Amino acid sequence: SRKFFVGGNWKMNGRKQSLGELIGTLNAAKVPADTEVVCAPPTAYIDFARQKLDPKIAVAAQNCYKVTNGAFTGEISPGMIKDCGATWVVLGHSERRHVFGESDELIGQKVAHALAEGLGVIACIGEKLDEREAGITEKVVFEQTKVIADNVKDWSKVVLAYEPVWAVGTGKTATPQQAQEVHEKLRGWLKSNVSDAVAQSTRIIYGGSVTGATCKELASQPDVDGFLVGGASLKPEFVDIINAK
Amino acid sequence: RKFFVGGNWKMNGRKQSLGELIGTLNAAKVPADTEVVCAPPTAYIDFARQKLDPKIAVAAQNCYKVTNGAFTGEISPGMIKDCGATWVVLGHSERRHVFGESDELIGQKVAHALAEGLGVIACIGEKLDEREAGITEKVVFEQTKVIADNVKDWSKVVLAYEPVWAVGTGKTATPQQAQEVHEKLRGWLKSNVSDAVAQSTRIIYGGSVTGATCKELASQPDVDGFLVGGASLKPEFVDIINAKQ
Ligand SMILES: [Br-]
Ligand SMILES: [K+]
Ligand SMILES: [K+]
Ligand code: NA
């Protein structure tokens, strides 16, 4: 019942001209109706992307803050994001957490505010390499998920993105079994801590060096409901990933 | 030194309210001897530039230190220029004190922004503890040094002094006290850069300024303008623009 979900995280890449070419490629591709496509452009280009992108494709912000307006130079709010015609926001991405130091608490507050303002949330979790090697992947993602869940009143507008940090921008894609393993546990966590209904209906997507050459096998895993795609979302093969079935 | 008035909208406004504010600014007779810059929320840089008359420049409220990269939620100087903005605000007290941006990182942002061809509003200022410890000079000179370590051409640079120690602290911050700091800052530029740079570099006041007080502040010989906060969202901003008239 879970609709296949493919997110394109352009990160801090591109200009109007090159991004326009990506958009032109997506519009011409005529995406299939049974996958939910979302593009997350650089914050300066949220409005631009929405204007050029086919309506059947949604636009996401790459980050936001936790109030509607305020004295926070350099930030944007969910209100501004919706005002630009976007309907999603990516929160908790490993780069926000581990380069810019966003705490779990802050991320939880952002999740609560974004949902309160009627914005969809792509909520990211994932363990570091040293956590994976120490055998505590499960403990880490469970705790990250707990903070998110405690700030979600409605899961219909939430998608969970498991991105192991050692796979993000490293070329080291998680194997199907590695991803399936974690997605299985996370769905089990939802069932035990939230509800069976939430467990069955919530999309849990994988991210981390997802490519056209790895998507098919990852997508076939029963608990992998789609992808969050960084590097490859800037390339023609993103279309192939959308069509991973 | 051409009088410089910057309006930092911070995280405020939507297309409707900002469109109305912009309408006022376009209709305003901006004096020819005053350089006016507006800094909208990042999502609205493109929107603001499209609507604003060329007589008013647009600034980003922040940026990152590389031209493209895996930095979800960030934007580069190239994107800022690509949207038609010609300035960026860096080192604002809120970036430093709420989001923990270090001097080192700030310096690296300045270096890249300038090389990309943007003007930089470089913000400095000491906190209350630093003020009451009697190390105002030590702190602001160090902040200024880090900026200076990353500036070859001072032509596109504007120093903004923020009396952070005066924000919500109950401490008096008089026009005389603003002059006292600005005089020392120019003294630093003269010794550590050149006579010409000291004479030509705008040093603007980033403390509390209103229509009723802007003229007394602007009459200080070493105060070359303002970085305006909340009043920048109101028609009162025009009165501040007109401070020299
Ligand atoms: Br990603
Ligand atoms: K599947
Ligand atoms: K003056
Ligand atoms: Na004109």
Polypeptide structure, described:
2 copies of one chain form a homodimer. By secondary structure, chain A is α/β, with parallel strands linked by helices. Chain A has a single domain (1-245), classed as TIM Barrel. Helices cover 40% and strands 16% of the residues of chain A. The first copy, chain A, has 11 helices and 8 strands. In chain A, strands 1-2-3-4-5-6-7-8 form an 8-stranded parallel barrel, surrounded by 4 helices. In chain A, strand 2 (35-40), helix 2 (46-52) and strand 3 (58-61) form a beta-alpha-beta unit. In chain A, helix 5 runs parallel beside helix 7 and helix 7 packs across helix 8. The radius of gyration of chain A is 17 Å and the shape is globular. The two termini of chain A are 14 Å apart. One potassium ion binds at residues 218, 220-221, 223-224 of chain B. Chain B: Its main location: cytoplasm.
By CATH, the topology of chain A is TIM Barrel
Protein chains sharing the most extensive interface? A-B, 45 and 43 residues
The fraction of residues assigned to DSSP E strands of chain A is 15-25%
Helix run count of chain A: 11
Protein name (chain B): Triosephosphate isomerase
EC number (chain B): 5.3.1.1, 4.2.3.3
InterPro entries (chain B): Aldolase_TIM, TIM_sf, TrioseP_Isoase_bac/euk, Triosephosphate_isomerase, Triosephosphate_isomerase_AS
Subcellular location (chain B): Cytoplasm
